[PDB]
Design a protein around this ligand. Structure first.
Ligand SMILES: c1ccc(NCc2cccnc2)cc1
Ligand SMILES: [Yb+3]
Ligand SMILES: [Zn+2]
Length: 607
């Protein structure tokens, strides 16, 4: 039961393939065309079925060359409106038909952001990008919008001829549009079955540069050189991912670097990972996000969660693989450092929600909950903490990586629940079942709050961060002079970040301390987005007015929700910036990403 979808479930029928033929109209901000669904009945005598839709305009539905009857149900908030289609002939079990739906999107499509030329790098052309996860695919095309169904797809996309279209698929050529010579048609094929949340489309003034044997980087011209360098470790990460997970089956691993309003650090669209330009630190320091997106090529895209209640399967195993990639590249002490930081972020998320909040559960119940509202670090870090704890219980990383590989092999091309995972865990480790039975499954999987057991972490790289943070927190006024730029001498960017994270957990600090920190460390000069984010939060929570314009600028000049949401909230909580925060939100709202706009608005208690 997928409680987020209004469509016929996989038990009733299942989409096998989508052929998408559409045209991107920047003047109207609509995508217009046809979705031909090849649908296989799972039932005897099937006479109707139901698809998800959201703010779609349906022109007609055609089966066997003729228009058929359909009806759009009443809108159910964020889930959209169900579309019931009356089949012309009753179908037997396993019979397949093709249903061709003519449709057009709304400019308000929660799947899409339409950018004016002035919102891009080049300032001449507009730009469009999608983001379907979790349940926004229904906002682009009518579909069974549930990850419990996997389909192949092909697409032909007509765009203004000066622009480029890309999708989560292999590029299959380009031509002039025979119906409109100011246009080009780009073609795409995705031969590996995917859940519909992995369908993606970008259209803009895109250039590419090759950075490995199976990876091009795509962006506007002004970001291409910087991106090629930032992500140069991509091939080496892919090789390691393939060693841990099995064959990379998707063909290409390209990267697309989006404009700054892109709402997530990255999105694992198959063949074309989408990433935030806030990763462009200049020193490859935020490359863990690439490792994470690469890892999804196995955990998430090959083995997929059956419903969003089981999202942690996708994320926990991805973070687990991500951290192994980073440990291979930079050493086991480094894996433990990132693991231990992740526990910190989990502490934060639980503290923010409250230790009894249902969204701090590992398996959640999304009945009547917008998935975008529930989204947090919990499934990532609670899921990782579970896997790390099991690793230590069951004999160590080599042993647990054997399990992870066998798990991917077992459930490739399938969608699964937590009980499937747990069942296979018990099967794989059946000689260690007595150890497995010592795990508090109910607490770990189903209870709110921090997990019942914290794993063991190497502290080596973290000690200096904690030590410096403690010096600052325990400092009195007459200790401030002792701080000096040399305190940072032997700290990496990852350590400066962890120092700020540790300090931010005890915020506010006295204003005099924060002013001193700027004096001696000049954190205002650091443009690493993770570091700047935490520093600005520490400044604002410690009531430093000078930081207000800095925080407002970062909150609005990029749109990664990880950064924009807490910055707006912090600025709302500070009396001196509260009205500015609300005003700035109001002014920027119309040009923000629709989901980001909705969430910041809720956070601010606005509109
Ligand atoms: C992208 C956007 C929203 C979601 N939401 C599903 C979800 C959130 C938190 C916990 N469990 C499941 C997932 C991906
Ligand atoms: Yb003193
Ligand atoms: Zn992920």
């Amino acid at each position: 039961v997928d409680t987020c979808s209004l469509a016929s479930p996989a038990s009733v029928c299942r989409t096998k393939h989508l052929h998408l033929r559409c045209s991107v109209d920047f003047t109207r901000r609509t995508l217009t065309g046809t979705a031909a669904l090849t649908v296989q009945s799972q039932e005897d005598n099937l006479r109707s079925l139901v698809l998800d839709t959201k703010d779609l305009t349906i022109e007609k539905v055609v089966i066997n060359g003729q228009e058929v009857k359909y009806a759009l149900g009443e809108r159910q908030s964020y889930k959209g409106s169900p579309m019931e289609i009356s089949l012309p002939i009753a179908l037997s079990k396993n019979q397949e038909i093709v249903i061709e739906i003519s449709f057009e999107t709304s400019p308000k499509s929660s799947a899409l952001q339409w950018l004016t030329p002035e919102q891009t790098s080049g300032k001449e052309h507009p730009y469009l990008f999608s983001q379907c996860q979790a349940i926004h695919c229904r906002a682009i095309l009518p579909c069974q919008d549930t990850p419990s169904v996997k389909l192949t797809y092909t697409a032909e996309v007509s765009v203004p001829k000066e622009l480029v279209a890309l999708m989560s698929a292999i590029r299959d050529g380009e031509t002039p549009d025979p119906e409109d010579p100011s246009r080009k048609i780009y073609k795409f094929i995705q031969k590996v079955p995917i859940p519909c949340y992995l369908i993606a489309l970008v259209v803009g003034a895109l250039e590419s540069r090759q950075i490995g044997p199976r990876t091009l980087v795509w962006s506007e011209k002004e970001q291409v050189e910087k991106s090629a360098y930032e992500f140069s470790e991509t091939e080496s990460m892919l090789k390691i991912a393939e060693d841990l997970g099995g064959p990379y089956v998707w063909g290409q691993y390209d990267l697309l670097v989006l404009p700054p309003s892109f709402p997530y650090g990255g999105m694992e669209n198959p063949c074309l990972t989408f990433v935030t330009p806030t990763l462009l630190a200049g020193d490859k320091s935020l490359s863990n996000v690439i490792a994470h997106e690469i890892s999804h090529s196995w955990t998430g895209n090959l083995v997929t969660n059956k419903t969003w209640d089981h999202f942690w399967l996708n994320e926990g195993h991805t973070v687990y693989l991500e951290r192994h990639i980073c440990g291979r590249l930079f050493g086991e002490k480094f894996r433990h450092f990132n693991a231990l930081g992740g526990w910190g972020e989990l502490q934060n998320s639980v503290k923010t929600f409250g230790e009894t909040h249902p969204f701090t559960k590992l398996v959640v119940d999304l009945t009547d909950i917008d998935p975008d509202v529930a989204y947090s670090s919990v499934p990532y870090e609670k899921g990782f903490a579970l896997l790390f704890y099991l690793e230590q219980l069951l004999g160590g990383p080599e042993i647990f990586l054997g399990f992870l590989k066998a798990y991917v092999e077992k459930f490739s091309y399938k969608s699964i629940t937590t009980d499937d995972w747990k069942d296979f865990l018990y099967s794989y480790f059946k000689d260690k079942v007595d150890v497995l039975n010592q795990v508090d499954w109910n607490a770990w999987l189903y209870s709110p709050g921090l997990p019942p057991i914290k794993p063991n972490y190497d502290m080596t790289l973290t000690n200096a961060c904690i030590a410096l943070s403690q010096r600052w927190i325990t400092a009195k006024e007459d200790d401030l002079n002792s701080f000096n730029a040399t305190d940072l001498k032997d700290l990496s960017s990852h350590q400066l970040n962890e120092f700020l994270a540790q300090t931010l957990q005890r915020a506010p600090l006295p204003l005099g301390h924060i002013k001193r920190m700027q004096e001696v460390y000049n954190f205002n000069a650091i443009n690493n987005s993770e570091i700047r984010f935490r520093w600005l939060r520490l400044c604002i929570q410690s009531k430093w007015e000078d930081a207000i314009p800095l925080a407002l600028k970062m909150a609005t000049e990029q749109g990664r929700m990880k950064f924009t949401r807490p910055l707006f909230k912090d600025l709302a909580a500070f009396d001196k910036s509260h009205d500015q925060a609300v005003r700035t939100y109001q002014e920027h709202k119309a040009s923000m990403h629709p989901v980001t706009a909705m969430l910041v608005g809720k956070d601010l208690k606005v509109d």
